[model samples]
Target chain A: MACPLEKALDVMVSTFHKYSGKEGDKFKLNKSELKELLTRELPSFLGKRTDEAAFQKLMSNLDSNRDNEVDFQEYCVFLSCIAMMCNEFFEGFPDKQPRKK
Target chain B: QRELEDATETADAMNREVSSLKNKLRRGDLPFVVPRRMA
Candidate 1:
């Protein structure tokens, strides 16, 4: 779409393809690609620096089907949950002006 | 009243957040289109 936000979403999908295509399973994110995606694109969410144990733990939980790879659906759920967590944090702001109830 | 009325011009802002919220999840290897309609 023409909107900048819409284009941002396009980049989101494109970003997945960018890394996912690097190795095996062109459409899905293997462990290495997933790590790169998280480390690079989501540095703030994960951390400025990536940790091996952190990724290992996350990988275990994220691969719900135990396929050892993350498909789009799994990635979506994880991101949605992270967004939900951040939304809660923002909504908890102590001094935010309330314009709408 | 005028400003609130003006804010009702379109769902773009609201939809933008919804789209942003929906961006994380990928489905079945197919790209998901964020629903933009307001009803």
Candidate 2:
């Protein structure tokens, strides 16, 4: 079976390309815009964690460049990690480990 | 609880949208911006 990590990374990168205006052009999301996007578009899953401070902390932690904004590449990396976290959170098992005997 | 419900609905819709967008990206169906592309 294909690795979920690769699949998840592909999805994230694809999303970045879709929203960031072409494969080569730079796509940037400022703090407020990113928050709004999350609040409005990811409400179902992200609603419970809409606190501004929490979101700010998340951005800070994920934004490697420390520019207070996320570009396409940065956003993809951040989201890929988030996806991995989601898999871990929901699957509750190691990615490649077989079930314990 | 009306406000809470509304908030929940809004959040749900947002999450769905994001997920849909991700799916599109994975499928390579999403359009990329050309140098002069405009909405």
Candidate 3:
């Protein structure tokens, strides 16, 4: 996988492992793990400092099976959704304009 | 056209990679490292 996109996917998986292996369930991320992952790895995604209520809502959205935890599959799906969100951000500006009001 | 072509190329590559990842997940081919315990 010499392609940059492939490498990006590798980074994504490895980053997930970095956080998911911390708490209980080596293959999944519990609430705190997910929180730390977003707080550190994806700070801008939250748009502000993490809050208790906001975090709970984010976790509920990610916990697709309602098991109170996020597995690799769920995490991957979340990334896919975020990729779509990112597309909306940049796709319109073909000239790659700066993000300013 | 150049930038659009490049974006299309990358997007196509990303699509194939994503599909492969799904296959790996179903086939249980993805690797997971085992964490060590402190003694």
Candidate 4:
């Protein structure tokens, strides 16, 4: 059986590939491009608490090279981090604690 | 048993998709959202 972590990584990679425009398009993840993509797509999932500063912090943490932009690998890593966060969050809510039976 | 079975089924389906995506990535196929742009 595939481990949950492996599954999460796969999902991240798949999601990254899905969003990162391929060969023909002009939508590469340059600095401006990355900012636009994150602002548009990450808001709902990350919640209203995630403002520009938070986003910048996240981008810097994920962008190992300290580059303002996230390339494919960096994007994948970011997605994987989100996936792991989701997994952890869900794991914490496995079941509703029953009231006194 | 029923609950276990349902959980297992869902896990299996998820694993299948994960495996498929892994294979596709390995084979160099672009994922659905990524456009096929030129360099």
Q: Best candidate per lDDT, number?
A: 3
Recovered fraction of real interface contacts per model: 0.01, 0.00, 0.00, 0.00
lDDT of 4 at A95: 75
lDDT string for model 3 (A1-101, tens) is 37789776786778888888888766688778877887676665554355666556555555646676887766765565445434434455332644420
What is the per-residue lDDT of model 1 for residues B1-39, given as tens digits with 9 covering 90 to 100? 486565434344434433433332222121221121100
lDDT of 2 by residue, A1-101 (tens): 87777765465555544434422343666555555555553444352444666656555543555666776544654453334334433555534463320
Q: What DockQ does each listed candidate score? A: 0.05, 0.02, 0.03, 0.04
Please, what is the whole-model Cα lDDT of each candidate in the order they appear?
A: 0.53, 0.46, 0.56, 0.48
| Candidate 4 lDDT (Cα, 0 to 1) | 0.48
Q: What is the TM-score of each candidate against the true structure?
A: 0.58, 0.45, 0.59, 0.43
Grade the docking of candidate 1.
incorrect
DockQ, 0 to 1 scale, candidate 3 = 0.03
RMSD of 3: 13.4
In candidate 4 the C-alpha lDDT for residue A21 amounts to 58
Which segments of model 2 are wrong by more than 4 Å?
A: A1-26, A94-101, B1-39
Q: Which candidate's DockQ is highest?
A: 1
Candidate 3 stretches with Cα past 4 Å from truth are A1-3, A93-101, B1-39
What is the C-alpha lDDT profile of model 1 across A1-101, one tens digit per residue?
37777665576677778788878866688777877876666655552334665555455555656675877656655555455434423455333554320
TM-score of chain A of 3: 0.78
